[PDB]
Amino acid sequence: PDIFQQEARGWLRCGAPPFAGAVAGLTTKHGGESKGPFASLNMGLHVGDDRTDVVNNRRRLAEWLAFPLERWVCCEQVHGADIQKVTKSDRGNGAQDFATAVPGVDGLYTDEAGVLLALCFADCVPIYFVAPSAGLVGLAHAGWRGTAGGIAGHMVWLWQTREHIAPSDIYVAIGPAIGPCCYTVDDRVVDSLRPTLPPESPLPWRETSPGQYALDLKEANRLQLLAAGVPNSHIYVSERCTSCEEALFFSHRRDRGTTGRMLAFIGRREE
Ligand SMILES: O=c1[nH]cnc2c1ncn2[C@@H]1O[C@H](CO)[C@@H](O)[C@H]1O
Ligand SMILES: [Zn+2]
Ligand SMILES: [Zn+2]
């Protein structure tokens, strides 16, 4: 059964055992207020949707999770590989106004409870991190550019060097994202990814016609995490494809570039 399991409303809970101490999941497209190409639980404030609808969609998730919107932290998501540590002093950044999101980064982490990391997705890989013993959670957004930039291994490096967490204490869930079934790229993309994998490494793409590659970004990120020291048995990978599962997900590719965003989220409750 998939590690992301449908809840009673428009979200999937991350059911990997190491995440049992966290509020962790990914929304589906249903149960919201948005219309047209954004129908209906569009969580993205920077896709041209009605802001009132989007904020109400976020308030709806906050109700489902019992995790108030005032406690979320969002980031700009510039398709780079930069990551920011956040704390309760960052709560609300980007939660209702995109202009206040943490700028210039594509991943966040925190070692505090009461802080919901919240990133938007519609094909790119959501990478959830937890070190349960140490109370760390993290979340990163990895499309091809962020993967080429090594964002997944950068999170691990920051936890090791700044938070003094061995990679062996880290657990990862790679969430729903576009699969190689639906994601075809060119030599430019694969060439940018080759340097990030070990020399002996199996390549997470297949050339389906000359110069065209079916690319598995989930596996690319898994291979990077393994190389950074995260144990194989600590890495859980969803098989769900955002493009394929049209009844659950917005997809930038399938929806031809005008669509909503799901929210990936992780945080720990404050008692
Ligand atoms: O509210 C938002 N927060 C973060 N990114 C957003 C938002 N709305 C639209 N995008 C866009 O969605 C992609 C992430 O997969 C990024 O390209 C970002 O610019
Ligand atoms: Zn993206
Ligand atoms: Zn697919």
Swiss-Prot record:
Binds 2 zinc ions. One zinc is catalytic and mediates binding to the substrate, while the second is probably structural. Zn(2+) 2 binds at residues 181-182, 241, 244. It holds the Pfam family Cu-oxidase_4. Its EC number is 2.4.2.1, 3.5.4.4, 2.4.2.28. InterPro entries: Cu_polyphenol_OxRdtase, Cu_polyphenol_OxRdtase_sf, Cytotoxic_necrot_fac-like_cat. GO terms for molecular function: adenosine deaminase activity; copper ion binding; purine-nucleoside phosphorylase activity; S-methyl-5-thioadenosine phosphorylase activity. Inosine binds at residues 45-46, 261. It catalyses: adenosine + phosphate = alpha-D-ribose 1-phosphate + adenine; S-methyl-5'-thioadenosine + phosphate = 5-(methylsulfanyl)-alpha-D-ribose 1-phosphate + adenine; inosine + phosphate = alpha-D-ribose 1-phosphate + hypoxanthine; adenosine + H2O + H(+) = inosine + NH4(+). It comes from the Bacteria. Zn(2+) 1 binds at residues 79, 124, 141. Its cofactor is Zn(2+). Keywords: Hydrolase, Metal-binding, Transferase, Zinc. Purine nucleoside enzyme that catalyzes the phosphorolysis of adenosine and inosine nucleosides, yielding D-ribose 1-phosphate and the respective free bases, adenine and hypoxanthine. Also catalyzes the phosphorolysis of S-methyl-5'-thioadenosine into adenine and S-methyl-5-thio-alpha-D-ribose 1-phosphate. Also has adenosine deaminase activity. Belongs to the purine nucleoside phosphorylase YfiH/LACC1 family. This is Purine nucleoside phosphorylase YlmD. It comes from Geobacillus stearothermophilus (strain DSM 13240 / CIP 106956 / 10). The lineage of its organism: Bacteria, Bacillati, Bacillota, Bacilli, Bacillales.
